[PDB]
Ligand binder design. Structure first.
Ligand SMILES: CCCCCCCCCCCCCCCCCCCC(=O)O[C@H](COC(=O)CCCCCCCCCCCCCC)COP(=O)(O)OCCN
Ligand SMILES: CCCCCCCCCCCC(=O)SCCNC(=O)CCNC(=O)[C@H](O)C(C)(C)COP(=O)(O)O
Ligand code: SF4
Ligand code: SF4
Lengths: 383, 90, 84, 135, 199, 45, 216, 119
């Protein structure tokens, strides 16, 4: 008959959803966002380039250093700054540690939303180990502010690689005992198989990236097609599935954790000795002993910590294979010590736009599975 | 099967404030300790933008563009992936 | 002719009376909204909405746009088969 | 690439590879062949005649189609065309069909209709390492 | 295992597709039809009598008899490093004179604008502050002020347990920051004896 | 010869300010404040 | 829908020599010669894809943005299938103060491109919702933040700011802290918006050197 | 005949059609009437009666539309209508010819050293 749609309000308690149903089947989904919009793009125009760096830790706060990476690379390209070899290796190693942290949280929060509670509690102790790795090099468990223009902020303390190797020696066993509860379980399969299917044409038309794109049969990894730092030296595989399923994305994310472990092991054995910061003193601040003994270093310390370096006029867009997809910064420079315009491109913003076409024909108990498999964090969505 | 939770002294045997060997961190290159001149390495201020002559009556030959392309599986040449970004020796 | 031409006229005058920008004695049974009473389009829309409130009708945009006089409004209400 | 399925898949059989990555389900269930590529490219070569003869757009499309047909002619197997043009043939047939579809919209817009003294300024970028590093 | 079945499909379009067409037999990720009696019994012992639930149950029962990772706070603590960024503090020389000389570099670098400084010259001619405030509810705990200081006057100490009941208790003035430094001076010096090799 | 800051991105900023059709945009007095959406007493200052 | 997984071996290469040479060197001239009426200005600069290359920037009129984007999506040599973002930049010194910027990615040949349109506050830009499906939310955000009207959009409404929010925050003449602030009133029993008052006003530090040469 | 297609009166008619549902949903039955609400919304329209550009008229109508659906969808409650719509109108028509002979200047003088900002 002339059946009107029944509508539903889904949660003030920070995603708001307005669904329409024709019974038990959804016909429309409209996300209402902006409950975490804090105006960080306006606030970055009132900061110097070093001042605005800790804003990026608070965009995807599950994956911090990867958010820092693209802003730093965008500044370095316009400045024409080269990063030394050891700093590039450190950046790759901590980017892969960051990806492991993000994928642990994403898979276990998804499986908790579905109903399995134990894998969350099993994976968060490994997350605690990697937080200790963040804290030992930056003094902060989450918002490290570690990656800087021209390199990293401090050197690795003596004894870090020993412990990273000791964690990586048992992480595969942890991922194995994680999959015994979920991979060959019929309830998890019946919740995840053929739910929210994405084909390749829809993936490129809807601006998808990351593990969504690899589960639809597309071989596209930015660490292999447009490499940055020492990612071209790294030997690893791109996992590929072909259904576009929630189940296939779960399998791709687990394999990406395995490949991140492989890159971590390679970085632990090829870590070179040398400088970790670029030797251009007009961009990178001097060491604290040098500042207390030479006049030029003290002048450069004074000026770099007040006015900051001046970026030459121009523009660039630089992107990083963040663990949720492509994270990019569009930096517009007029020539000052402050960004003229800093647009932030987030993958979860594009992934959440698809919920109207992905939830069609699904039921109410599959909305939370779709939201969980898109891997969304509203700090980067709502800038 | 590797066990989670290692026992005593098998993980983080020394605290980071009691490092058993003193650390000597390089903060400058040996090439720049006594050779300090800057204008030979001022990459920031030496880039240029040049206005091209007005792209109107140029000759785009498509024959040359498609004459350098292969037609057989062998004789296909691929650009290798760059191993590292430029470090300029440091 | 669905309703009389006197009671509708005094009801029209009664709702025209309570307008702050109108004169309570200048209102005549046969006047104009533009030249005589001095009203723009939004005032005309407000007066037609008051007439709709009093007689319990619905006048569309084109029909209310054609109404330009007190006599036009009275004739439109009288010609309406659903008046109250 | 790495296959996330725990079963052993051959992937030397090209039809199995086209099944596994979702080409059959999501792009084209009918297998694309060399003859369909030739037919689609000749459709483009017929469709481009709506553009003027002197236009660079027509020359560009015609040269691309002629090169694609020469690759199709000098290679008999479809794996050879895959290795030369760096795609699956289903992708290449879709490319040719999209290029043929593009022509009436461009022809309706007529980008070639500029005045004789048309001018476009271009600004190019020169790196510092051109003049600082060794020649 | 990651294999698929006709019937275990979570949606309806694929459920309708698998029961009306044999397109799923071409896909290599599907489990094939059993061919003889023993394979039928294996498939039925997979579907009926569970045995996939039981593997997870055996793993969680093994975890029931395993070791635990809980620490008994506040009798036991976690693990931190000398670089840890905690409660801000103001430092002195061993003589007892303040290190701070009112250069206003930490106030300039602060991205949160959490520092407010006023100064004049002391009665002996020295350059010293008269006001040094840190809004701890505006602070982001980045440590940039610690980096900008050329005389090691402002630090972030090793204290993280400083929650209060009123917000006015978290607007620190100069006297409280000096009191924090006088409390934590030996630990701060022990931390800085290691971290000066790197900074 | 012409060389007035002819080695930086400001060449690409001076043009893109003189693109035709966009170099002749004009509004009436006080009109941009009506569409700005900020309170109207701000323009009494 | 491109970049399907085809090689089962590890690939140690990015692109082919001839297509990478064409994309990194000849693409600006190619786009200018094939569709000259669409292009009004071009910049070839420091390359969104990598630090080692150069990549073009195309300036176009709003009257031909949709045909140019359709050409850049569907032409056989420029297969720009992915639209990464739409944004704006404010230049208050210009007659047309806004530059709407479109970034694109070509998975077929590992390329990127940038497309710009210059408009003022009262000139509409045609929507790209029919060309790219992500153009919806980005155009909604651009309207929210800058006040650029996108004609032909299905539902152009604000997406990021507060419910009653008038004003476009990313303009240069909009204040950083705004005009209104929010508190709970015990008498009205409602959360109420009030004119702005600050306990400590924002301190603006003017650091800029009078010897600095780079300011443009 | 009516400038710029008569779009101001068409939008005014649309809002006046929308108004009784606003009064029922926001429960403003005993606070304001439909006649005074129509007069208030009419007074919102007269403030831009001297706009000489049709594109500014179209933008103003689009923005007023988005205001009317954020009132329709209960994204602003009755206290928002009170503090933003009807009390500014009643303040602009209540202070006219006050009971005191003080000029506006002298009231401003006795209030503060500077003019008031906002409402
Ligand atoms: C302590 C608590 C104990 C329970 C712990 C585990 C909880 C599991 C809950 C989920 C169970 C799933 C389930 O029952 O699945 C069904 C199969 O299993 C069943 O039907 C299982 C119940 C029946 C046991 C086996 C009965 C037949 C055995 C042999 C009888 C003939 C020989 C002897 C006379 C149907 O799932 P499906 O996939 O099969 O559905 C066919 C269509 N998709
Ligand atoms: C719940 C409350 C929410 C209300 C929000 C909605 C408020 C919307 C208000 C904004 C809409 C506008 O102003 S729309 C802008 C209106 N101004 C113009 O269009 C410029 C031309 N001037 C006119 O049209 C005049 O009305 C006139 C000279 C009298 C023409 O006489 P007539 O009339 O005879 O035709
Ligand atoms: S730690 Fe950061 S937020 Fe705290 S006072 Fe120092 S610079 Fe400011
Ligand atoms: S604490 Fe250090 S940086 Fe801050 S004003 Fe005092 S001396 Fe300067």
């Amino acid at each position: 008959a002339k059946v009107n749609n029944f509508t539903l309000n889904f949660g003030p308690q920070v995603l708001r959803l307005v669904l329409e149903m024709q019974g038990e089947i959804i016909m429309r989904a409209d996300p209402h966002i902006g409950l975490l919009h804090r105006g960080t793009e306006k606030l970055l125009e009132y900061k110097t380039y070093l001042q605005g760096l800790p804003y990026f830790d608070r965009l995807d706060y599950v994956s911090m250093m990867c958010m820092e990476h693209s802003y730093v690379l965008a500044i370095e390209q316009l400045l024409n700054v080269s990063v030394p070899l050891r700093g590039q290796y450190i950046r790759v190693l901590f980017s892969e540690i960051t990806r492991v942290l993000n994928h642990l949280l994403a898979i276990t929060c998804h499986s908790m939303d579905v109903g399995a509670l134990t894998p969350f509690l099993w994976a968060f102790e490994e997350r605690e180990k990697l937080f200790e790795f963040y804290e030992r090099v930056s003094g902060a468990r989450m918002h490290a502010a570690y990656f800087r223009v021209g390199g990293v902020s401090q050197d690795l303390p003596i004894g870090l690689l020993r412990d990273v190797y000791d964690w990586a020696r048992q992480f595969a066993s942890r991922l194995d005992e994680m999959e015994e509860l979920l991979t060959g379980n019929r309830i998890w399969k019946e919740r995840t198989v053929d739910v929210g299917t994405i084909t390749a044409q829809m993936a490129w038309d809807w601006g998808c990236s990351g593990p969504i794109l690899r589960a639809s049969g597309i071989d596209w990894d930015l660490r292999k097609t447009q490499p940055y730092d020492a990612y071209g030296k790294m030997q690893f595989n791109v996992p590929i599935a072909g259904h576009g399923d929630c189940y296939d994305r779960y399998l791709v994310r687990l394999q990406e954790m395995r490949e991140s472990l492989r890159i971590i092991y390679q970085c632990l054995n090829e870590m070179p000795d040398g400088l970790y910061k670029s030797p251009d003193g007009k961009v990178c601040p001097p060491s604290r002993s040098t500042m207390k003994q030479s006049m030029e270093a003290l002048i450069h310390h004074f000026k770099l910590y007040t006015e900051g370096f001046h970026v030459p006029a121009g523009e660039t867009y630089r992107a990083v294979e963040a663990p949720k997809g492509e994270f990019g910064v569009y930096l517009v420079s007029r020539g000052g010590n402050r960004p003229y315009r800093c647009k932030i491109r987030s993958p979860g913003y594009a992934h959440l736009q698809m919920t109207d076409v992905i939830s069609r024909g699904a039921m109410l108990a599959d909305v939370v599975t779709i939201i969980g498999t898109l891997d969304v964090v509203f700090g980067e969505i709502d800038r | 099967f590797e066990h989670y939770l290692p026992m005593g002294l098998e993980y983080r045997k020394f605290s980071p404030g009691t490092q058993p060997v003193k650390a000597v961190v390089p903060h400058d290159s040996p090439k720049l300790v006594y050779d300090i001149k800057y204008f030979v390495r001022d990459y920031r201020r030496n880039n240029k933008y040049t206005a091209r002559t007005v792209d109107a009556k140029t000759t785009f030959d498509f024959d040359k563009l498609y004459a350098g392309m292969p037609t057989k599986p062998e004789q296909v040449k691929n650009v290798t992936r760059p191993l590292i970004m430029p470090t300029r020796g440091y | 002719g669905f309703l009389d031409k006197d009671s509708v006229t005094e009801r029209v005058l009664h709702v025209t009376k309570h307008f702050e920008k109108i004169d309570a004695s200048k209102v005549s049974p046969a006047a104009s909204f533009e030249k005589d009473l001095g009203l723009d389009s939004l005032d005309v829309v407000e007066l037609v909405m008051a007439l709709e409130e009093e007689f319990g009708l619905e006048i569309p945009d084109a029909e209310a746009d054609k109404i330009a006089s007190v006599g036009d409004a009275i004739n439109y209400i009288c010609s309406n088969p659903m008046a109250k | 690439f790495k296959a996330v399925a725990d079963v052993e898949i051959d992937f030397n059989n090209r039809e199995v590879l086209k099944k596994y990555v979702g080409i059959r389900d999501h792009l084209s269930k009918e297998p694309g062949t060399r003859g369909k590529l030739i037919e689609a490219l000749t459709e483009v070569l017929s469709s481009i005649k709506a553009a003027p003869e002197g236009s660079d757009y027509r020359k560009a499309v015609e040269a691309s189609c002629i090169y694609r047909l020469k690759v199709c002619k000098e290679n008999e197997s479809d794996a050879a065309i895959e290795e030369v043009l760096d795609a699956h043939l289903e992708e290449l047939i879709k490319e040719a069909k999209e290029e043929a579809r593009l022509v009436p919209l461009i022809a309706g817009n007529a980008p070639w209709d500029v005045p004789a003294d048309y001018a476009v300024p271009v600004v190019d970028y020169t790196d510092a390492a051109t003049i600082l590093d060794a020649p | 295992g990651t294999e698929r079945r006709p019937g275990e499909s979570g949606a309806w379009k694929q459920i309708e597709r698998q029961r009306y067409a044999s397109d799923w037999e071409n896909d290599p990720t599907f489990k094939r039809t059993p061919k003889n009696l023993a394979e039928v019994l294996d498939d039925s012992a997979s579907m009926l009598l569970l045995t996939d639930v039981w593997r997870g149950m055996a793993y969680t029962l093994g975890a029931f008899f395993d070791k635990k990772v809980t620490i008994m706070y506040p009798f036991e603590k976690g693990q931190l490093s000398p670089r840890f960024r905690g409660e801000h503090a103001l430092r002195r020389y061993p003589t007892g004179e303040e290190r701070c000389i009112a250069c206003k570099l930490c106030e300039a670098i602060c991205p949160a604008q959490a520092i407010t400084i006023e100064a004049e010259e002391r009665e002996d001619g020295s350059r010293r502050t008269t006001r040094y405030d840190i809004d701890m509810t505006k602070c982001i705990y980045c440590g940039f002020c610690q980096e900008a200081c050329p005389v090691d006057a402002i630090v972030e100490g090793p204290n993280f347990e400083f929650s209060t009941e009123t917000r006015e208790e978290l607007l620190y003035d100069k006297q409280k920051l000096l009191e924090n430094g006088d409390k934590w001076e030996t630990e701060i010096a022990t931390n800085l004896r290691t971290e000066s090799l790197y900074r | 010869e012409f060389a007035t800051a002819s080695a930086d991105y400001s060449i690409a900023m001076k043009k893109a300010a003189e693109i035709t059709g966009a170099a002749e945009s004009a509004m009436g007095p006080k009109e941009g404040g009506f569409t700005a959406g900020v309170p109207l007493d701000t323009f009494t200052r | 829908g491109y970049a399907y997984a085809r090689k089962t071996t590890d690939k140690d290469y990015i692109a082919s020599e001839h297509m990478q040479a064409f994309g990194n060197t000849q693409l600006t001239d190619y786009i200018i010669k094939t569709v000259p009426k669409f292009v009004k200005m071009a910049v070839t600069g420091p390359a969104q894809s990598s630090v080692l290359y150069q990549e073009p920037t195309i300036y176009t009129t709003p009257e031909s943005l949709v045909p140019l984007m359709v050409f850049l999506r569907d032409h056989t040599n420029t297969q720009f299938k992915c639209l990464l973002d739409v944004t704006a930049v404010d230049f208050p010194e210009r007659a047309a103060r806004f530059e709407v910027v479109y970034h694109l990615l070509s998975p077929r040949w590992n390329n990127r491109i940038r497309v710009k349109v210059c408009v003022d506050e009262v000139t509409a830009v045609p929507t790209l919702c029919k060309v790219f499906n992500t153009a919806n939310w980005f155009e909604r955000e651009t309207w929210d933040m800058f006040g650029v009207f996108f004609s032909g959009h299905p539902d152009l409404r604000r997406i990021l700011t507060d419910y009653g929010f008038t004003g476009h925050p990313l303009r240069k003449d909009f204040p950083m802290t705004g005009y209104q602030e929010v508190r709970y009133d015990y008498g009205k029993k409602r959360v109420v918006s009030e004119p702005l008052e600050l306990t400590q006003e924002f301190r603006y530090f003017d650091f800029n050197s009078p010897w600095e040469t780079l300011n443009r | 005949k009516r400038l710029f297609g008569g779009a101001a009166r068409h939008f005014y008619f649309e809002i006046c059609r929308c108004l009784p549902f606003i009064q029922r949903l926001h429960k403003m039955e005993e606070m304001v009437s439909l006649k005074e609400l129509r007069a208030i919304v009419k007074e919102k329209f007269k403030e831009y009666k001297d706009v000489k550009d049709g594109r500014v008229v179209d933008l103003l109508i689009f923005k007023g539309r988005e205001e009317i659906e954020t009132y329709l969808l209960m994204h602003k409650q009755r206290h928002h209508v009170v503090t933003e719509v009807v009390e500014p109108y009643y303040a602009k028509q209540r202070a006219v010819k006050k009971v005191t002979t003080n000029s506006p200047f002298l009231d401003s003088f006795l209030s503060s050293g500077y003019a008031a900002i906002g409402v």
